[PDB]
Structure 1
Amino acid sequence: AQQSPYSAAMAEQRHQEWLRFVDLLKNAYQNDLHLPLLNLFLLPDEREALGTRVRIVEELLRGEMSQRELKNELGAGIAIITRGSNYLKAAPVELRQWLEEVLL
């Protein structure tokens, strides 16, 4: 299923729309408007999920909590641990090194 000019054109547009959000948020942090901006663009349950994903990443990096603890404390089952681990492994090395410094 190789990509066509139609599919490539749509994918480029979606990427530019994502970058426009990223840039809006960047400027909101510089204006101290990021809290209401994130409340406008993210639903309550989405904000809750992001806060939980940070805890999962933190605990996976620390390597102390067992899988049972991850489930009971964070609601994180084996599937989400596996995905979370894959995303950590796929991260650029500069990000992983920075997350170990900030979260730990």
Structure 2
Amino acid sequence: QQSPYSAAMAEQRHQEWLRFVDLLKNAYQNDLHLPLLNLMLTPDEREALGTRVRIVEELLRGEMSQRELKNELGAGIATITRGSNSLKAAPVELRQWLEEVLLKSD
């Protein structure tokens, strides 16, 4: 098989990913997102995404310490730091939107 690092494989994985994104958009529009995501993801993957969202929310809120976050979520420090790095790599427009969504939800 080909290298996973080739441009060709990058293009293939990029186009297939966007097909998934569009199918999930349509599932949300028809209220089928939950069964689609149970089809397309494993339990561990859904668990990881739940953990990651809580890490994002608590890092942006700034109220909990890393120690408290580790205990509350059962996620190690390395995972929390990867989440902080991932936030910093994301566009400012997304980070600000997330902050605003959280602010209003209080």
- In 2, distance between residues paired with 1:15 and 1:77? 30
* CA separation of 1:96 and 1:3: change in aligned 2, threshold 3 A: farther
- In 2, distance between residues paired with 1:52 and 1:9? 33
1:42 positional shift: 0.9
Contact preservation (8 Å) 2:66, 2:77: yes
Question: Residue in 1 aligned with 2:25?
Answer: 26
* CA separation of 1:29 and 1:77: change in aligned 2, threshold 3 A: same
Identical columns (%): 96
Contact preservation (8 Å) 2:3, 2:9: no
* CA separation of 1:61 and 1:4: change in aligned 2, threshold 3 A: same
Aligned length: 103
* CA separation of 1:62 and 1:3: change in aligned 2, threshold 3 A: farther
- In 2, distance between residues paired with 1:62 and 1:52? 15
Contact preservation (8 Å) 2:70, 2:80: no
Deviations 1:38-57 (A, max 9, x none): 01011112111111111111
**TM-score, normalisation: structure 2:** 0.88
**TM-score, normalisation: structure 1:** 0.89
Question: Residue in 2 aligned with 1:50?
Answer: 49
- In 2, distance between residues paired with 1:6 and 1:53? 26
Contact preservation (8 Å) 2:27, 2:36: yes
1:76 positional shift: 2.2
**What's the Cα RMSD here?**
2.8
* CA separation of 1:45 and 1:3: change in aligned 2, threshold 3 A: closer
1:6 positional shift: 8.6
- In 1, distance between residues paired with 2:57 and 2:92? 16
* CA separation of 1:12 and 1:75: change in aligned 2, threshold 3 A: same
Structure 1, unaligned runs of 5 or more: none
